[PDB]
Amino acid sequence: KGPVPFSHCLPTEKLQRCEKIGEGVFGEVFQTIADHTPVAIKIIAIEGPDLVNGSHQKTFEEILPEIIISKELSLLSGEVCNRTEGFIGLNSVHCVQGSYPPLLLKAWDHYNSTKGSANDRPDFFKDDQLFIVLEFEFGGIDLEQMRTKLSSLATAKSILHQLTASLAVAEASLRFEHRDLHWGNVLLKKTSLKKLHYTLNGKSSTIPSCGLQVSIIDYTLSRLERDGIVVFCDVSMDEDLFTGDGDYQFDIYRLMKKENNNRWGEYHPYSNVLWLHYLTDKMLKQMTFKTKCNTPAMKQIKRKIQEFHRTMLNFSSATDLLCQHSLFK
Amino acid sequence: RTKQ
Fold this sequence. Notes:
Protein name (chain A): Serine/threonine-protein kinase haspin
Order of helices and strands of chain A: EHHEEEEEHEHEEHEEEEEEHHHH
Distance between the termini of chain B: 6 Å
Radius of gyration of chain B: 3 Å
Strand order of the largest sheet of chain A: 1-7-8-4-3-2
Family (chain A): Belongs to the protein kinase superfamily. Ser/Thr protein kinase family. Haspin subfamily.
CATH architecture of the largest domain in chain A: Orthogonal Bundle
Strand content of chain A: 15-25%
Domain Protein kinase (chain A): 15-329
Shape of chain B: flat
Largest sheet of chain A: 6 strands, mixed
Largest interface: A-B, 13 and 4 residues
Subcellular location (chain A): Nucleus; Chromosome; Cytoplasm, Cytoskeleton, Spindle
Helix content of chain A: 25-40%
Radius of gyration of chain A: 21 Å
Number of helices of chain A: 9
Number of helices of chain B: 0
Active site (chain A): 180
Oligomer: heterodimer
CATH topology of the largest domain in chain A: Transferase(Phosphotransferase), domain 1
Number of strands of chain B: 0
Structural class of chain B: little secondary structure
Distance between the termini of chain A: 54 Å
Strand content of chain B: under 5%
């Protein structure tokens, strides 16, 4: 086993049906239908001496925490004490030895001709390499291309409620800090269920859905604790993240750095609250809604959201924010 | 993204 060629992991039927959706420093994102269900494929370069896309290759023991936290966050959606379906499930992980097949290369070329990419052409890579394959379940369209597609303010309220509830269960269960909620990292999926079930510490509750479901992805820079041991990544020696400008998302990194005195190994749940603040900032300024604001009740909820935005920062944690702020009662 |  181990480094098998991509033929076994990806048979011809799935290769011809791959559409390429996203990109990043990590690697590639592909979409295909397998077992009569659309599944997401993420493939990354591993254990190479070469330099690609402005960074050298990553090494295996540094990518192990990624899969550990992914499989741990996947499993909690079945636990009886604390449960929610706000995460993406793990299907399979393997290792691939070889080069890049031409079909998905032409698919990337199609994407580049349509919208474009900021990375290099992955055609120089030889047979002797290794690769990593990630199978995730389809989430939908992220918030970044859905700016002109939301229904009204009630949908926004439900979105914030679902995000806050999911993070609350995450913290109450596994003491989680994910730290990278930029608005291109939340997934929306159409649904028919009218209400959602979430239980924290053995007490159940229900949330209106308005026909949408929310999930979180891209946990490459998260922290977790389990059975006295702590899993995370130390980023205290690379400062290009804290030199950003032009957006509040660039500022929040330096803000949490100020908060945690440059100690990434501590549990500071307040860090998530600033991310919720940032998300609320986008929902009030960088959004356009189909429906106007004429109905008095929707004016009321608009005032509620404004007060929530301006008075969240006095609050301690996500769970306390869930059980204390006036929005959710 | 994470890095500008």
